[PDB]
Amino acid sequence: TQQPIVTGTSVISMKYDNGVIIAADNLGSYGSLLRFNGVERLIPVGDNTVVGISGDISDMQHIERLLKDLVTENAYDNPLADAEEALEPSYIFEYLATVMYQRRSKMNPLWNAIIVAGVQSNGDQFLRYVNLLGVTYSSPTLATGFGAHMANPLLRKVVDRESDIPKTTVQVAEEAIVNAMRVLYYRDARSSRNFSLAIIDKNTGLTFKKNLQVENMKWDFAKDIKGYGTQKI
């Protein structure tokens, strides 16, 4: 048993017709101190998988090293390590899920919430969640922390059920993700303006975008707000 010290906030994701999108900001908070601004919380694994991690950053870095070891170990005595016997998103996840549940069962959790986004070899979209309790679930949209409360509602307006997936494009999906990151910057006190976004597409592969910023913000109405009830000037 422990307590999280350096923390990452929301990770948000959704699937679209040809793949999956996943995003997370670049902040490592220390309580209410916005301590570290160059923290990458999206971990790519090979060319078909991105793991997004929120929660304790010391644990995130430990999980990061586990994933690098998985790639190394998979390539041992494996002539098809970059072909048929390369790591699938489903393998990455099931491994992580196993670890998360064993650690919670030892009363010593990895204090995180994890979203594994990717595309399987057959072309299928992979999107699944796991957290410090070892709880797992899949949904057309997934998000951690504040993203669950604020991003899912917006993302679910685009993909409300399974049948909305083939109708949704990369452009529409990405715009919806980017809008949600702006909303989280408005209302989450542990969020940063700077974020990373990753697209995994069954045709165009892994597209990793760094150093994105929330743009097109509405603030001008604030000038007209004075007082808290009766004050006029």
Partner: protein, 222 residues
Amino acid sequence: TTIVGVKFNNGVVIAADTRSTQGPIVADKNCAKLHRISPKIWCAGAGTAADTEAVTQLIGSNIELHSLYTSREPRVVSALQMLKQHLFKYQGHIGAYLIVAGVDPTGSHLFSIHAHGSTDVGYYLSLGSGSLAAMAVLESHWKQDLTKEEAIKLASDAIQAGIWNDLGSGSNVDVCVMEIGKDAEYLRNYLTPNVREEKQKSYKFPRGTTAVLKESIVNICD
């Protein structure tokens, strides 16, 4: 509960869902959460339900008397000042969380009030368990200089976000529109997107299914 307020060019609209709960159980599937302070000052509540209803009626009563005494239309700032001073006195023990909105001779107004007595002012607000779902919609689609139709749509979309995504919110959408020049219009069950489907069976029993020990006529008259 999900409640929202949205200002538009010539007034203010408020809306709320209709689910009332006792823990995870749904007590009332069509509760009316939009209360009246005065004819053109309406109110939506969250938190302790008895406290929101009681505090809204007490201030509503005192506001009517004030209106009669002064021979003037009641002002939203008066409702605000009376609500917050009452709530502050009780140090949050009256668990009333309100979005209060209305029009008066000085114009249109939108405020929120928390249980400890603090108040906020804004062009769009949300409260209740569905607050974050509704706010996501408000932060995504709100703009300055909305029309009445656009504000009703936006507010209604915001309540829906709460209905579908928050477990503490559901059933229907109630709306009240308050415009500067006109009468306030309460739109009870403005949307009804959660109609229970036709059951598979009737459970009307054959008469005499229930065993009876004793039977008698009760006297009401005197």
